[PDB]
Scaffold this active site. Sequence first.
Site, PDB file in Angstrom:
ATOM      1  N   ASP A  52      37.551  32.326  45.081  1.00 41.02           N
ATOM      2  CA  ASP A  52      37.538  33.298  46.171  1.00 41.02           C
ATOM      3  C   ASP A  52      36.869  34.616  45.796  1.00 41.02           C
ATOM      4  O   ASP A  52      36.830  35.531  46.627  1.00 41.02           O
ATOM      5  CB  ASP A  52      38.961  33.562  46.687  1.00 41.02           C
ATOM      6  CG  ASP A  52      39.898  34.155  45.632  1.00 41.02           C
ATOM      7  OD1 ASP A  52      39.449  34.609  44.565  1.00 41.02           O
ATOM      8  OD2 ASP A  52      41.118  34.165  45.883  1.00 41.02           O
TER       9      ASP A  52
ATOM     10  N   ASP B 286      40.656  36.658  36.865  1.00 39.55           N
ATOM     11  CA  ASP B 286      41.883  36.720  36.071  1.00 39.55           C
ATOM     12  C   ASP B 286      41.583  37.365  34.719  1.00 39.55           C
ATOM     13  O   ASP B 286      40.555  37.077  34.106  1.00 39.55           O
ATOM     14  CB  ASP B 286      42.467  35.320  35.880  1.00 39.55           C
ATOM     15  CG  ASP B 286      42.368  34.478  37.140  1.00 39.55           C
ATOM     16  OD1 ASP B 286      42.995  34.839  38.158  1.00 39.55           O
ATOM     17  OD2 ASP B 286      41.632  33.466  37.124  1.00 39.55           O
TER      18      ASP B 286
ATOM     19  N   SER C  58      37.870  36.607  43.225  1.00 43.79           N
ATOM     20  CA  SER C  58      38.739  37.359  42.335  1.00 43.79           C
ATOM     21  C   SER C  58      38.554  36.889  40.890  1.00 43.79           C
ATOM     22  O   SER C  58      37.853  35.913  40.605  1.00 43.79           O
ATOM     23  CB  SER C  58      40.193  37.212  42.765  1.00 43.79           C
ATOM     24  OG  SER C  58      40.572  35.849  42.736  1.00 43.79           O
TER      25      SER C  58
ATOM     26  N   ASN D 211      45.652  38.103  37.963  1.00 41.28           N
ATOM     27  CA  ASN D 211      44.642  37.936  39.007  1.00 41.28           C
ATOM     28  C   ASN D 211      44.419  39.239  39.770  1.00 41.28           C
ATOM     29  O   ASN D 211      45.381  39.870  40.222  1.00 41.28           O
ATOM     30  CB  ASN D 211      45.111  36.833  39.970  1.00 41.28           C
ATOM     31  CG  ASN D 211      44.009  36.286  40.835  1.00 41.28           C
ATOM     32  OD1 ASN D 211      42.951  36.899  40.987  1.00 41.28           O
ATOM     33  ND2 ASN D 211      44.255  35.116  41.425  1.00 41.28           N
TER      34      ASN D 211
END
Length: 129
Positions: free
Chosen positions: A48, A52, A50, A59
């Site tokens: 998406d 980590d 994002s 995240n």
Amino acid sequence: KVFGRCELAAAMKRHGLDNYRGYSLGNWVCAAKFESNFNTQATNRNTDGSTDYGILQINSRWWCNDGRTPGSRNLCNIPCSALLSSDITASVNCAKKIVSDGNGMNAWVAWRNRCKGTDVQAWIRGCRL
Ligand SMILES: CC(=O)N[C@@H]1[C@@H](O)[C@H](O)[C@@H](CO)O[C@@H]1O
Ligand SMILES: [Cl-]
Ligand SMILES: [Cl-]
Ligand SMILES: [Cl-]
Ligand SMILES: [Cl-]
Ligand code: NA
């Protein structure tokens, strides 16, 4: 910084992670092993958009700000780069918030798939602590 297994266990225990929310120390060491291979500088991009960050792969969708995840939250109120430091204080304090949000350690995909239900005490076996 790439931690040794017993070095990381000691640092997590000092910061009060041991049995935090009922999760024994071996759970946190196992999770960090499989999320980051004990590397505080680990990063991984999600589908998406994002990312980590750090030794527990926290995240940016919810927990930290990296300036490139539009529509996301920063619930730990930290820049994501703080999760990459050789000092794990910021990762630990944010992990304490995450694990308290109702789902426990199921928020960590690697813990759910690779630690949950195993002999996680093996991960702190032989350490002095
Ligand atoms: C608590 C936390 O931020 N967990 C993340 C999760 O959001 C993400 O889906 C995954 C990607 O591999 O890594 C971590 O488990
Ligand atoms: Cl344990
Ligand atoms: Cl952002
Ligand atoms: Cl540390
Ligand atoms: Cl729980
Ligand atoms: Na964010």
